[PDB]
């Protein structure tokens, strides 16, 4: 009867909705550290660009709706500081009054997600230096753009947020610099595919600095320059975009197993090693369909899927999580960047014998007007020909191809089986053989 | 050593390429009735609209290449009138000189496709009455549009060609009427999905006449009117697009088995019941993955796949055709119309117990600008929940959804298994749950 959920977003509320719909008698307490429930973090870069009117448009479901319509005891400003798994008590500190509140549970879900990482650089706390995770985070970025005269913008880290925010700031008309400590931006992509990302960024006059290490942020009350090991550069706004960390530190003292990055280990049923404690979303581990191992690939699709499943399993409606494929898709200027399954570094690290096929193709019939280039790469096992992963880059029809590849990986298809699938063709949408099929035909 | 192929397009030449690549000692003779090899029939409507420069842009590989580069004895203007399967001789008539040539085979492939049907209406031979199949057919339509004052166009038959050519004629600024003997245009769609087709046509001022039967075409030399059982209407150009018939009449007297419509029955290996005689493409039957019987769904994707497989099997590189799903996609004005697997009429005619789910959704995140409506319907087995079919209609993202559904059907997935697939999400491409997955969740 007593369900407690820590975290009031994708994984947490997906679980809450399951419990509420499938048990009329349940007492559901959800504990949220912030003031905002069920909101779309994915839309934040597009609010900051001005493409979306305001952050209000990103709220999927109000806390008032959760309380009045679904009878969930949804708490805001309740930060969980510790859990006693023997007594089955959750301790939450009110973020403003600092008052401490106890919540006894029969079953507990941890759905605290991840937080962005800020390294211990000098200048960390300078005005105009920003992380991006929450709605207040985006408002603070908008506040800087509103009050300051922003011309030069520097982004540290060339992963998912870095890439999307590089677009956002270019669209806002700023001079954009990206600094990455690795060999290239779009680190999940293989060296060969990443060249297309670099080209697109260069095309829009984004300065890319690679194998370069941030030293400090210099400035007065506010950030003025980013210092690195190779130079000092003017920056009116700095976005720090260097990765994330599971919000699981408050579990120190429990016997709850975590991986090396602090992600909570879960079995097929979203259960931790501690009786009646569950975890879901970005704070938990994610079984990988292809790796056959628990990975950590924090993403919104997986968070919702895991949250829904945790809720179901907490009700003893037993259902296994089938896993992640590491699917990811990004809009980057005029390019769509998509990947799923293993890249070459992942396959190598696993000692899986693999081969690759790469095709420079078009999204649709070559003779049809405004047919655009499509670059597609597949990895497959050299012995069994099992499809392992894909990377697709292009202006159009990239999401379609990565979704088809994802379906193939999910069903453990051989690369040559792709040739036999009755995919759709008309001139405005595809070629008579899809690029995926033409790649498959090239495979050994 | 002696391979003979009848028909020089998609299925025939896919076969020819396989044989030539996988047997240097092969003597490949291909016999084509017309003057044009390997061309894209799919691009015909877009040549007529003027979207594509000319019909020359539709040739994939010309006869000179086949002859010079690949060593295929590719014959033009050779119409096969008879096959003696006992003596293993193909008899062909030169279409100009009418002289008779014979060709000895070790293995034979029939790849003669289908022809458009012209019912025996009075005035069917009038100038301005057109069928659409070949490049010359398209040039004859362009001849009428050029040399004659065309303002009113009547299309008979509301299927694939009728729908695409309605767009073409509207885009050319004509007053378009289409006449269907059935209850609605886009007959393969269920009644409820067909409503979206009617709305789009109505929006663009296409007169749709339903349950109406053409009886004659009126005029002196040219058409000036179409007579029906419900009236007589002015028409300066008439397109007859009422279906197709397999080009298999010349086989009467061979023992080669055909279905009721005249399509050549083939086994898994593209083999007929007659030793060393093969068939592929639109002239052949198509094993249906879901129906589990041999169907006839003539389409370019299937023709290439079967052509390729016939070539391979004629070399004794044994490989089974896995089947068709009945996948089809059509651009219709502002709409994209896609279907795959079973519709309700098919499921009913097969006595497969089924249920449906229909979702009115968006192609991408609802909060993202220019998110467009997406209408999606799934059929699934009542007992096992096996996915059976899908229909998707919308302005954007329809091809992606039907390809995912096709992949699911190919792998015999349960409808609820769709919930577990790590499909891609970013706001410009999808919602955090894809519409297919939301539909799947609604299923019983
Ligand atoms: C800029 C940006 C763009 C993104 N774009 C995409 C995209 O395009 N596609 C996609 O699939 N994903 C995207 N994501 C990722 C996606 O938004 C997240 O993976 C998803 O929100 C994770 O859901 P969750 O419920 O596990 O964690 P969260 O959504 O982070 O929810 C965790 C909640 O727990 C609360 N919490 C933390 N600690 C405590 C505590 N001690 N006590 C009480 N409450 C606590 C937090 O306040 C937070 O609200 C994006 C993320 C960002 C930041
Ligand atoms: C307007 C139009 C649009 C289309 N759009 C699409 C689409 O968007 N997507 C899609 O997948 N499909 C589409 N198709 C269908 C696709 O083009 C065909 O299914 C494909 O061409 C079939 O290939 P085939 O080799 O079996 O038959 P065909 O391409 O018709 O080839 C048969 C050949 O055999 C020859 N022949 C016939 N009889 C004899 C004989 N007795 N002796 C010698 N030669 C003979 C014919 O001249 C012909 O060249 C479209 C078709 C049309 C007409
Ligand atoms: C044009 C046509 C002859 C193509 O034949 P095809 O065999 O499919 O294509 P190609 O001859 O280019 O050869 C492709 C093969 O070469 C291989 N290949 C192509 N480029 C390669 C490369 N760069 N490196 C390695 N291999 C390559 C492919 O793997 C493929 O191998 P497979 O045949 O063993 O699977 C045939 O499709 C046709 O006649 N079509 C008519 C037009 C049409 O399709 N109409 C219907 C439209 S609706
Ligand atoms: C908003 C949120 C609470 C949605 O919860 P949800 O349970 O997925 O969705 P709903 O509460 O609308 O309920 C959906 C259920 O109702 C059913 N349903 C919905 N509409 C229906 C209809 N018209 N007819 C019949 N059934 C319907 C569905 O079948 C589904 O059933 P299931 O849960 O048993 O599979 C949750 O996703 C969330 O908190 N999200 C945060 C925002 C987010 O997604 N962020 C990450 C972005 S990267
Ligand atoms: N469309 C989508 O799928 C989107 C998803 N997201 C979500 O947000 C999460 C986090 O995004 P993000 O913050 O970009 O994290 P990412 O891991 O995606 O990117 C961080 C990048 O910064 C690099 N980096 C680390 N330290 C430094 C440093 N000191 N100097 C320069 N570069 C450094 C990392 O390299 P290294 O490997 O060496 O650490 C990595 O390449 C994602 O996992 C995803 O869940 C966000 C936006 C869009
Ligand atoms: N994008 C794509 O997938 C495209 C594919 N094609 C290919 O071309 C082939 C043939 O297309 P098409 O010619 O349109 O054939 P279709 O079967 O697609 O459509 C013909 C329609 O005309 C109807 N009809 C039959 N007789 C009459 C009549 N006397 N009066 C009015 N309507 C009548 C048929 O109904 P009924 O069922 O009762 O006979 C049917 O609805 C397709 O099978 C496909 O292979 C062509 C264009 C686009």
Q: How far is the CA of B161 from the centre of ligand 6 (A)?
A: 6
CB of A78 closer than 8 Å to CB of A101: yes
Question: Looking at the structure, do residues A121 and A211 belong to the same domain, yes or no?
Answer: yes
Say which of B58, B324, B331 has its CB closest to residue A422: B324
Nearest residue to B436 via CA among B405, B403, B398, B397: B405
> Could you give the CA distance from residue A91 to residue A85 in angstroms, rounded to a whole number?
11
3-state class of B383 per DSSP?
Answer: coil
Question: What CATH number does residue B103 fall under?
Answer: 3.50.50.60
Sign of the alpha-carbon dihedral angle for B398, B399, B400, B405: positive
Whether residue A42 lies in the annotated active site: yes
Residue in B15, B17, B33 to alter for ligand 2 test, most ligand atoms within 8 A of Cβ: B33
* Helix (H) or strand (E) run with residue A156 in it: strand A152-156
Q: Which of B40, B287, B403, B428 to mutate to test the interface with A (most CBs of A within 10 A)?
A: B403
- If one counts the domains in chain A, the total is 3
Say which of A42, A399, A406 has its CB closest to residue B422: A406
Give how far the C-alpha of residue A140 lies from the chain's centroid of Cα atoms, to the nearest Å.
Answer: 21
> Could you give the CA distance from residue B103 to residue B110 in angstroms, rounded to a whole number?
14
Chain breaks in chain B (C to N over 2.5 A) after: none
Question: Looking at the structure, do residues A415 and A363 belong to the same domain, yes or no?
Answer: yes
Measured between CA atoms, the residue of chain A closest to residue B302 is A422
A-B C-beta contacts closer than 8 Å? 177
Sign of the alpha-carbon dihedral angle for A124, A129, A134, A140: positive
Q: Which residues, in sequence order, are CB contacts of A370 under 8 Å at separation 6+?
A: none
Question: Looking at the structure, do residues A10 and A94 belong to the same domain, yes or no?
Answer: yes
Task: Give the determination technique.
Answer: X-ray
Residues in chain B with CB shorter than 8 Å from the CB of A325 are 421-422
Question: Looking at the structure, do residues A215 and A140 belong to the same domain, yes or no?
Answer: yes
Residues in chain A with CB shorter than 8 Å from the CB of B302 are 422
CA dihedral A138, A210, A199, A427 (to 10 degrees): -70
What is residue A281's DSSP assignment?
Answer: G
Question: Looking at the structure, do residues A126 and A225 belong to the same domain, yes or no?
Answer: yes
- Residue B183 is assigned to a ligand binding site: no
Last residue of a domain, one of A306, A327, A348: A327
Range of the domain at B199: 41-58+114-244
Of the candidates B1, B35, B42, B199, the residue annotated as catalytic is: B42
Query: CA angle at residue A443 from A441 to B2, to 5 degrees?
Result: 50
> Could you give the CA distance from residue A146 to residue A140 in angstroms, rounded to a whole number?
10
Question: Looking at the structure, do residues A125 and A185 belong to the same domain, yes or no?
Answer: yes
- In the Cβ-directed half-sphere of B281, how many Cα atoms lie within 13 Å? 28
Of the candidates A1, A35, A42, A104, the residue annotated as catalytic is: A42
Question: What CATH number does residue A433 fall under?
Answer: 3.30.390.30
Nearest residue to B246 via CA among B13, B83, B40, B7: B7
A425 and B329: CB-CB below 8 Å?
A: yes
> Could you give the CA distance from residue B396 to residue B402 in angstroms, rounded to a whole number?
12
Question: Looking at the structure, do residues A46 and A190 belong to the same domain, yes or no?
Answer: yes
Residues in chain A with CB shorter than 8 Å from the CB of B52 are 367-369
Looking at ligand 5, which atom is closest to the CA of residue A297? 43
Residues in chain B with CB shorter than 8 Å from the CB of A429 are 329, 331, 336, 399
Question: Looking at the structure, do residues A372 and A442 belong to the same domain, yes or no?
Answer: yes
> Could you give the CA distance from residue A231 to residue A214 in angstroms, rounded to a whole number?
9
Say which of A46, A408, A426 has its CB closest to residue B42: A426
Question: Looking at the structure, do residues A161 and A146 belong to the same domain, yes or no?
Answer: yes
Question: Looking at the structure, do residues B278 and B219 belong to the same domain, yes or no?
Answer: no
Last residue of a domain, one of B327, B343, B370: B327
> Nearest bound ligand to CA A121?
5
Q: How far is the CA of B312 from the centre of ligand 3 (A)?
A: 13
Q: Which of B426, B430, B442 to mutate to test the interface with A (most CBs of A within 10 A)?
A: B426
Measured between CA atoms, the residue of chain A closest to residue B58 is A367
CB of A344 closer than 8 Å to CB of A356: yes
3-state class of A144 per DSSP?
Answer: helix
Strands B354-362 and B373-381: antiparallel
CA dihedral B414, B419, B422, B427 (to 10 degrees): 140
> Could you give the CA distance from residue B182 to residue B200 in angstroms, rounded to a whole number?
18
Name the resolution in angstroms.
Answer: 2.3
Last residue of a domain, one of B181, B215, B244: B244
Question: Looking at the structure, do residues A181 and A49 belong to the same domain, yes or no?
Answer: yes
Nearest residue to A196 via CA among A335, A343, A357: A335
Question: Looking at the structure, do residues B96 and B159 belong to the same domain, yes or no?
Answer: no
> Could you give the CA distance from residue A216 to residue A405 in angstroms, rounded to a whole number?
42
Residue in B46, B155, B159, B168 to alter for ligand 6 test, most ligand atoms within 8 A of Cβ: B159
Q: Which residues, in sequence order, are CB contacts of A263 under 8 Å at separation 6+?
A: A246, A248, A283, A284, A285, A296
> Could you give the CA distance from residue B310 to residue B318 in angstroms, rounded to a whole number?
9
């Amino acid at each position: 009867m007593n369900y407690v959920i820590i975290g009031g977003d994708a994984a947490g509320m997906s679980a809450a909705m399951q419990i509420v719909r499938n048990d009329e008698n349940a007492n559901v307490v959800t504990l949220e550290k912030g003031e905002i429930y069920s909101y779309a973090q994915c839309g934040l870069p597009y609010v900051i660009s001005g493409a979306i009117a305001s952050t209000e448009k990103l709220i999927a479901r109000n806390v008032k709706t959760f309380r009045d319509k679904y009878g969930i005891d949804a708490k805001v400003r309740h930060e969980v500081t510790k859990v006693d798994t023997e007594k089955k008590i959750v301790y939450a500190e009110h973020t403003k009054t600092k008052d401490v509140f106890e919540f006894s549970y029969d079953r507990l879900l941890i759905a605290t997600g991840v937080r962005p990482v800020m390294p211990e650089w000098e200048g960390r706390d300078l005005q105009g230096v920003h992380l991006l995770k929450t709605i207040p985070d985006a408002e603070r970025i908008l506040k800087t753009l509103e009050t300051n005269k922003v011309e030069d913008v520097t982004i540290i880290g060339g992963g998912a947020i870095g890439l999307e925010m590089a677009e956002t700031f270019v669209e806002l008309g700023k001079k954009v610099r990206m600094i990455e400590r690795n060999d290239h931006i779009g680190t999940i992509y293989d060296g060969d595919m990443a060249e297309y990302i670099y080209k697109e960024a260069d095309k829009h006059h984004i300065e890319i600095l690679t194998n370069e290490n941030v030293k400090a942020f210099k400035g007065n009350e506010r950030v003025e320059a980013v210092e690195t090991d190779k130079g000092t550069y003017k920056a009116d706004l700095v976005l720090v975009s260097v990765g994330v960390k599971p919000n699981t530190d408050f579990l120190e003292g429990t016997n709850i197993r975590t991986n090396h990055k602090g992600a909570i280990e879960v079995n097929a049923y979203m259960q931790t090693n501690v009786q009646d404690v569950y975890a879901a979303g970005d704070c938990a581990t994610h079984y990988h369909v292809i790796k056959e191992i628990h990975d950590h690939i924090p993403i919104g699709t997986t968070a919702n899927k895991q949250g829904r499943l945790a809720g179901l399993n907490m009700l003893d409606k037993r259902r296994a999580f089938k896993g992640t494929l590491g699917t990811g898709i990004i809009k980057f200027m005029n390019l769509t960047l998509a990947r799923t399954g293993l890249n070459e570094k992942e396959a190598k690290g696993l000692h899986i014998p693999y081969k690759t096929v790469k095709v420079d193709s078009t999204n649709m019939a070559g003779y049809y007007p405004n047919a655009k280039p499509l670059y597609l790469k597949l990895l497959y096992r050299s012995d069994t020909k099992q499809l392992l992963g894909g990377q697709v880059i292009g202006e159009e029809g990239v999401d379609k191809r990565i979704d088809v590849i994802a379906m193939a990986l999910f069903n453990k298809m051989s690369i040559h089986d792709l040739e036999d699938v009755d995919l759709s063709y008309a001139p405005p949408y595809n070629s008579v053989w899809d690029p995926i099929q033409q790649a498959a035909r090239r495979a050994e």
